Every structure is written in structure tokens, then in C-alpha cells.
Design an enzyme around this catalytic site. Structure first.
Site, short mmCIF file in Angstrom:
data_model
loop_
_atom_site.label_atom_id
_atom_site.label_comp_id
_atom_site.label_asym_id
_atom_site.label_seq_id
_atom_site.Cartn_x
_atom_site.Cartn_y
_atom_site.Cartn_z
N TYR A 246 0.76 -1.47 -0.12
CA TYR A 246 0.16 -0.06 -0.09
C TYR A 246 0.87 1.47 0.03
CZ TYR A 246 -3.98 -2.92 0.60
OH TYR A 246 -5.09 -3.91 0.40
N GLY B 97 2.59 4.22 -1.36
CA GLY B 97 2.74 5.03 -2.69
C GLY B 97 2.06 4.39 -3.63
N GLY C 267 0.52 0.30 -5.52
CA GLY C 267 -0.33 -1.01 -5.04
C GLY C 267 -1.78 -0.79 -4.99
N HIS D 19 -3.82 4.86 5.89
CA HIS D 19 -3.77 6.15 5.16
C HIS D 19 -4.59 6.19 4.11
CE1 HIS D 19 -1.81 9.19 2.44
NE2 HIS D 19 -1.78 10.02 3.62
N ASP D 20 -4.71 5.33 3.42
CA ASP D 20 -5.70 4.98 2.09
C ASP D 20 -7.05 5.02 2.69
OD1 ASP D 20 -3.74 4.83 0.18
OD2 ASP D 20 -4.06 2.57 0.03
N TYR E 110 -7.94 8.46 3.58
CA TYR E 110 -8.23 9.30 2.16
C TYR E 110 -9.60 8.85 1.77
CZ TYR E 110 -3.88 11.46 1.29
OH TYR E 110 -2.57 12.37 1.21
N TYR F 283 -3.69 22.03 1.98
CA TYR F 283 -4.11 22.27 3.15
C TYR F 283 -3.12 23.02 3.61
CZ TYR F 283 -1.20 18.00 4.10
OH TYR F 283 -0.22 17.05 3.93
N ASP G 118 -2.44 12.61 6.34
CA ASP G 118 -0.97 12.91 6.24
C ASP G 118 -0.33 12.74 7.37
OD1 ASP G 118 -1.62 12.74 3.57
OD2 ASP G 118 -1.23 14.75 3.13
#
Lengths: 122, 122
Positions: A27, A29, A31, A47-48, A51, A64, A89
Site C-alpha cells: 500500500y 505509494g 499498489g 492512510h488510504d 483518504y 491544506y 497525512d
């Protein structure tokens, strides 16, 4: 946006750090399929998921506001979707820094054949 | 998902995305701000805006159905999220392949120290 995510990573872990997260595990970056390979990869999976919960804005493009205060990442002045993106982030960069000791260079640049479909849910 | 987009990039450009397009310009790599630097970067900005329209589909992890048959990229989903993510990737890989002759290695790893111009608007 990713430009800012990169700066958080570099400011927390040290110059050039962001290039370590371009393609790592299933995951980080690139993938986007399979069971996370370790704690750093799990940070990226979370993090995904983070998001994925954002609505109305584009996480790669939304700018941001954040700063470093005594070396810590501080999100501030953000409204709505900008707030949520910055927090995604911030938490991921902190999670990479926490798990830096177990980064495994053999998990860099994995092919999709190493990340078989699983039931991994957010 | 990004593994699948990587396969489309390989098929249209002959490059491995994690070592080239993933770190390129202001829009292909970790930027999302600034000016698109060339035609390759503009393909990626169009893909970023495309992903922005299907944010709720979670393009990073959305594993869609596609096939390369007869040298073409064909998206097979009936499901609108999966299909649209696949069409975003298909269009970007086509665009990238159309501009591979201007691909400039000076834009690899460029994002972190440049990309501060007023940003493109989707």
C-alpha cells in the site's frame, strides 16, 4: 496534497525520506491490494482508508495548511475536507517515523503478484 | 488500483511506473500543485482531475476488471465506480504512451524542490 505529504515525511524522518515510500509493501505509494506486509505498510493502508473517507475534495490535489513546531507536524487553519486530508497525512507521517526501525528494503517495489487479493477491510 | 494502472503504463510506454511516472513532474509524482511541466505531466494532471470526480470510488484500492486483448486496453465493469476508475487509468496510460518521446528524466524526483507555481485547476 502529495507535495505536502512528502514534506511531512522528510521533515519527520530526514531528507530524502519520502523516496522510501514511493512503492513499498502492498500500500505505500503504489499498489492498493492485498494484506499489508508489516507495520509501515499498515500505516499506508490506514492512510488510504483515511483518504477513502474524505468527501468532496481530491486528496492528491487539495492544498491544506500545516507547519512544524519544534519538529512536530501541526495541522492548522484547515476547514472541512482540508482538515481531514491534513490529519490523514499527519498521522501517516508520524506512523512511518514510529515504525522506521522495521522498514525492510526487500518490500520496496513489489509487483502485484506479491499482493494477492485478501479480505482486508478499512 | 495502482498495480493495474502500472500494467497499463507498461503496455503503452514500456516503462515501469514505480521507477518513472510515479516520481515525475508536478502531477505524475508526489506533487499536486504547481504547473504541469510538459505533455506527460499534463496527462497526469488530467488523470488527477479524473480521480477527483470518482473520489468516493477510492481509486487507489479499487480493483477493476480490464483486459489487454489485441493491443487495446478495454475496461469491462458494469459497476460505475470500477469502470470509471479503469477509464481514468486507461485514458492516462494512452496519453502517456502518446507522449513518451518527450519524457524528460530531469522531471524525475523534481516535485519536492519545485512545483510552487500557481496550480492547475481541474
Amino acid at each position: 496534497n502529495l507535495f505536502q505529504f512528502a514534506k511531512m515525511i522528510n521533515g519527520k524522518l530526514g531528507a530524502f525520506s519520502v523516496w522510501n515510500y514511493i512503492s513499498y509493501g502492498c500500500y505505500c505509494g503504489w499498489g492498493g491490494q492485498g494484506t499489508p506486509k508489516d507495520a509501515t505498510d499498515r500505516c499506508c493502508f490506514v492512510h488510504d482508508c483515511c483518504y477513502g473517507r474524505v468527501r468532496g475534495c481530491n486528496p492528491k490535489l487539495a492544498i491544506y495548511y500545516y507547519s512544524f513546531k519544534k519538529g512536530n507536524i501541526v495541522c492548522g487553519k484547515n476547514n472541512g475536507c482540508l482538515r481531514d486530508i491534513c490529519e490523514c497525512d499527519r498521522v501517516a507521517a508520524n506512523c512511518f517515523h514510529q515504525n522506521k526501525n522495521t522498514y525492510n528494503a526487500n518490500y520496496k517495489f513489489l509487483s502485484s503478484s506479491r499482493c494477492r487479493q485478501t479480505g482486508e477491510k478499512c | 488500483n495502482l498495480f493495474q494502472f502500472g500494467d497499463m503504463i507498461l503496455q503503452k510506454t514500456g516503462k515501469e511506473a514505480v521507477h518513472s511516472y510515479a516520481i515525475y513532474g508536478c502531477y505524475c509524482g508526489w506533487g499536486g500543485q504547481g504547473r504541469a511541466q510538459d505533455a506527460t505531466d499534463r496527462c497526469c494532471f488530467a488523470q488527477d482531475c479524473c480521480y477527483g470526480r470518482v473520489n468516493d470510488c477510492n481509486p487507489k484500492t479499487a480493483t477493476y476488471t480490464y483486459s489487454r486483448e489485441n493491443g487495446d486496453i478495454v475496461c469491462g465493469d458494469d459497476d460505475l465506480c470500477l469502470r470509471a476508475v479503469c477509464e481514468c487509468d486507461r485514458a492516462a496510460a494512452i496519453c502517456l504512451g502518446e507522449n513518451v518521446n518527450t519524457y524528460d528524466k530531469n522531471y524525475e524526483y523534481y516535485s519536492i524542490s519545485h512545483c510552487t507555481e500557481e496550480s492547475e485547476q481541474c
